């Protein structure tokens, strides 16, 4: 019917992940990369899981889709391009995530 906002639906939030010594999470998927085992028709980037419960513990959740990173769009891009971008970033890494909604 219309765009959602103040209700249960596809939201758009940002997260601040400071690298010290590193981010603390892995990424999967990508257009032409190794592939993502979460979505069949979607070849985007997903945060499969987290190891250290500190940097991306309360920020990012397992199985989330990354829409944008530090201004660089992560849609329709190749995996190798996504990883290279995340690694080159300075200390504080600002990212945008979204939670799907389908009943």
């Amino acid at each position: 019917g219309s765009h959602m906002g103040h209700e249960l639906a596809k939201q758009e939030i940002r997260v601040r992940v400071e690298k010290d010594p590193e981010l603390g999470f892995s990424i999967s998927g990508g257009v032409g990369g190794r592939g993502n085992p979460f979505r069949p028709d979607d070849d985007g980037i997903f945060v499969t899981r987290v190891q250290p419960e500190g940097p991306a513990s309360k920020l990012l959740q397992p199985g989330d889709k990354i829409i944008q990173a530090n201004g660089y769009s992560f849609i329709n891009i190749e995996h190798g391009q996504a990883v290279s971008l995340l690694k080159t970033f300075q200390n504080t890494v600002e990212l945008i995530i979204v939670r799907e909604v389908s009943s």
């Binding site: 981010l23 892995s26 999967s28 990369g33 190794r34």
Partner: peptide
């Protein structure tokens, strides 16, 4: 298999 990459 390999697919997950830790950044």
């Amino acid at each position: 298999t390999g697919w997950e990459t830790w950044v």
